[PDB]
From a paper:
Based on the domain boundaries identified by mass spectrometry, we generated a truncated ScPml39 construct comprising residues 77–317 for structural studies. ScPml3977–317 was crystalized in the P3121 space group. The phases and the structure were determined to a resolution of 2.5 Å by Zinc single-wavelength anomalous dispersion (Zn-SAD). The majority of the fragment (residues 79–311) was well resolved in the electron density, while no electron density was observed for two N-terminal residues (77–78), residues 148–151 between β3 strand and helix αC, a Ser-rich region comprising residues 213–226, and six C-terminal residues (312–317). ScPml3977–317 contains two BIR-like modules: zf-[name] (residues 79–189 in blue) and [name] (residues 190–311 in purple). The two zf-[name] and [name] modules form a single structural domain stabilized by the hydrophobic residues Leu87, Ile90, Pro111, Leu112, Leu185, Tyr189 of zf-[name] and Tyr190, Phe272, and Trp291 of [name]. Cys134, Cys137, His172, and Cys176 residues coordinate Zn to form the C-x2-C-x–H-x3-C ZnF motif. Due to the different spacing within the CCHC ZnF motif, helix αC of the ScPml39 zf-[name] module is tilted by 42° with respect to the corresponding helix αC in D. melanogaster IAP1-BIR1 domain, rendering the distinct spacing a key determinant for the topology of ScPml39. Cys268, Cys271, His288, and Cys292 coordinate Zn and are part of the C-x2-C-x16-H-x3-C ZnF motif. Thus, the distinct CCHC ZnF spacing between Zn-coordinating residues and helix αAB′ insertion between helices αA′ and αΒ′ represent key determinants of the [name] module.
In [name], the pre-[name] leakage 39-kDa protein (ScPml39) was reported to retain unspliced pre-[name] prior to export through nuclear pore complexes (NPCs). ScPml39 is required for cell growth in the absence of a functional Y-complex, an essential NPC building block required for [name] export, and is recruited to the nuclear basket of NPCs by virtue of interactions with the N-terminal regions of ScMlp1 and ScMlp227. The crystal structure revealed integrated zf-[name] and [name] modules, which are tightly associated through a hydrophobic interface to form a single domain. Both zf-[name] and [name] modules belong to the Zn-containing BIR (Baculovirus IAP repeat)-like super family, with key residues of the canonical BIR domain being conserved.
Numbering used by the authors: 79 to 147, 152 to 212, 227 to 311
Write the structure that this text describes.
Amino acid sequence: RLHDLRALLKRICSIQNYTRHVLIEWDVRWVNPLTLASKGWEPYQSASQSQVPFKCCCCHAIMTIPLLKVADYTMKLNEKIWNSNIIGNHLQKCPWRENQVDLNKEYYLSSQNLIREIERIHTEIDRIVSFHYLSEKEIQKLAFFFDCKDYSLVGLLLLGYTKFQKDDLVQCTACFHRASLKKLEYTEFNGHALWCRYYNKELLPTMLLELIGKE
Ligand SMILES: [Zn+2]
Ligand SMILES: [Zn+2]
């Protein structure tokens, strides 16, 4: 399937993985791991200090993202790259040229896919039994809805994270940034990319609370 969520997520994850040893100036609209993945692009080879190559999973066509050490022309350049490379480099009849994953429907939060977040949180809690930024009033209700006594775990999962290593590392499920639990203890620090589903921390808990009020 072209719009399969799991394939999109794995493309995003691989892009983030091979980009870790490099700093890239993404933008929320034109060029970012999300838009690349939504257009079927996967990492092709290891990126040099100057350019990051990608290959289409159907075409096998190659595109490249430049690197510079910047803010003056990022917008115009990235819009050009989106039109000419992320779309253009596709072969004429490749499905990814004229089609794109519906990110609003499948990736970003909506009332029709909030249940997936509920499932994720419940599954994480079950696998465990097997971060305060909301009012005590609110976290009480959120923890109650998930039948969980550990408020901090509920908050952490509401931030979209999941444990990564035996170490203090924790990884986001939608943008795959890595943060230390020590960082998130008593800090406003937002570890998400600007384009992440969870970048606005209050969005998911707010939708969940509004859902609670309607039951
Ligand atoms: Zn293609
Ligand atoms: Zn994230």
